[PDB]
Design a protein around this ligand. Structure first.
Ligand SMILES: [Ca+2]
Ligand SMILES: [Ca+2]
Lengths: 90, 91
């Protein structure tokens, strides 16, 4: 394809109190890119703890009922790009 | 066993909403980590600001923003060779 896939905006680090919801969002250059999220470099295990949202080129990860266990670096991956930010559960 | 095969476990509902209001469909599937596929009249929806696609565990949801009469259609969630359809009527 004419234009190369990349992740456009960067992602800010977030701090949330325990039990509150945390969200990460990023945007990509192309439609029809699948979401792929890592926690500390490893694919997140899908469960009712995580909501994955896509709207247009916006990809969101929603982390429910946070605990100190959720404090980590989260990464979105597509093509040859990736973007990371930290969650601190307070 | 039945769990060796991916399948729809809970259907979505027919729905009516007034113009410009938000509409949503929710179904459930048998397994975690299933991709979402949504159709509008048999054809894959085009990703845009119009549609929010949500997966939470086994729950799959399509949210249709700012409805218009052009949104009135049969929507389908596709789970491999398994499908579920329901109608949005924008009134
Ligand atoms: Ca970038
Ligand atoms: Ca079925």
């Amino acid at each position: 394809a004419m234009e190369t896939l990349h992740i456009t905006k960067t992602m800010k680090n977030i701090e949330v109190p325990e039990t509150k919801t945390a969200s990460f969002e990023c945007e990509v250059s192309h439609f029809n890119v699948p979401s792929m999220w890592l926690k500390n470099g490893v694919e997140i295990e899908m469960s009712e703890k995580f909501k994955i949202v896509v709207q247009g080129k916006l990809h969101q990860l929603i982390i429910m009922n946070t605990s100190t266990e959720d404090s980590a670096e989260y990464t979105f991956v597509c093509g040859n790009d990736q973007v990371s930010a930290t969650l601190t559960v307070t």
